[PDB]
Amino acid sequence: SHMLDGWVPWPESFARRYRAAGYWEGRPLDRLLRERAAADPDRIALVDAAGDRWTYAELDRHADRQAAGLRRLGIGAGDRVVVQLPNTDAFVVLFFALLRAGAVPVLTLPAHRESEIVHVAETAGATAYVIPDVLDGFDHRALARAARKAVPSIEHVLVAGEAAEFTALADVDAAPVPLAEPDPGDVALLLLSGGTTGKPKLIPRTHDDYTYNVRASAEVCGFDSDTVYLVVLPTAHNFALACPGLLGTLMVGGTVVLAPTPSPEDAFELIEREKVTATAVVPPVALLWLDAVEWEDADLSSLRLLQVGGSKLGAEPAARVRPALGCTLQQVFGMAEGLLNYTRLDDPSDLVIQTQGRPLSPDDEIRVVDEDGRDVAPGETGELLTRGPYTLRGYYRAPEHNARTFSDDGFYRTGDLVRVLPSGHLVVEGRAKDQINRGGDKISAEELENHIMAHPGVHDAAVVGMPDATMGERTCACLVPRAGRSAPAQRELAAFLTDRGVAAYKLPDRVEVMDAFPRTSVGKTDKKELGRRIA
């Protein structure tokens, strides 16, 4: 029996082993804050970009007051809440307040627009939506009005800022009240996957498996009470939230420092000002920082650990990290779906430069299979399948995609092409999944194609990746025009997609027009050939 339907729990035999092995410790996710504020109440837990800071005891108390305020509004006990917030202290307090109210955060990114928000609010049956007022020039309150129009279940909008006709997140406050703990085997939160189908997909993560994710990652990355972790990626991104991210920093009693952007102007000042020891970035930001140190004067000496993940970091810039930035590189090949691969902090430099790490857990299980689903010879390239104590057995409320994406014995098909080396380290070699990886941002080709084909000058669309030296892939939209009509150019299509509510990172970099698509025998559009036909 579970608070939430729509997800796929682990078979009992596996759950017993993970509990026996100490992975699943039986504590709700919010307890990592409760426990740390009990042991170290006066340590500095969180610093924002303005220099304001909060102790563990202050964070813990404020999460209790906001949880009490959430219950006064009728939000708790299994209700799904879409959270779209920037890297501010407001996100951190709300995350734990939602957990302690019994609500299930549905974490979205500030870049997401109407199509993503409506779909995940509609899938989750969300009853509340948390937004900023204006962020990066965009009024999210307008988006929250469109969302309430399309999703009647949304009864409350909480605004971090000028709430307009909605509720101000700062007024969600009340005298703490006894609140029961959730079952640690229940879903704790729902993450977004970029996905590979026509609609984004929600990832259920339980208290037990997400606490393990955080705890085990913190151990592998050497996170301790002397760690000062700079949150450069969005707080709601799995990498910056839990690998080990801010949750690992708070669990071990370190200091979380929130960066408003990854620009050297913002990040280098915070690293010097707060003596940041660890941070995580995607390869395009790594390249930028590696460049910027030759004209920035900031003292970055306090840096000890640079995690780089989301897409593959090249061997040449990876070798540059110690000379240029004076810190240890750690390559992280992970996914919101679960499996994390880490290079170890004292791995030989050869393996930090050339590989994307090895699995986090002793009980992460790895298969590498060919196109016939058969295991490959050792060291050959094939598709990575994985099963383990923090990898999901199914997406939330997605039974048709679950039937395609997990094997009968519960192996998740990652869609990544890898080699496994004799030491156990993986090298990422490519992708099988139809998803473009644009600087770490994931674009489901089928979702984008459906959006584009809605344009009246478009009959058919095939979205193809293009190699890019600093972003990895860019997005090409290959179009068949609507009969007797002219297909749009790049800027017009971009404006169409933005008004439709498509996130900005999914807008095509290039448009190619053609009368027909290359098809394989079997009849599917040949995207390997499109990659050849187009440029």
Ligand SMILES: Nc1ncnc2c1ncn2[C@@H]1O[C@H](COP(=O)(O)O)[C@@H](O)[C@H]1O
């Ligand atoms: N270090 C890395 N190298 C190459 N690809 C990566 C790496 N980390 C993550 N990915 C890709 O990102 C996907 C999941 O990303 P996300 O769910 O956004 O964390 C994986 O399945 C890989 O395709």
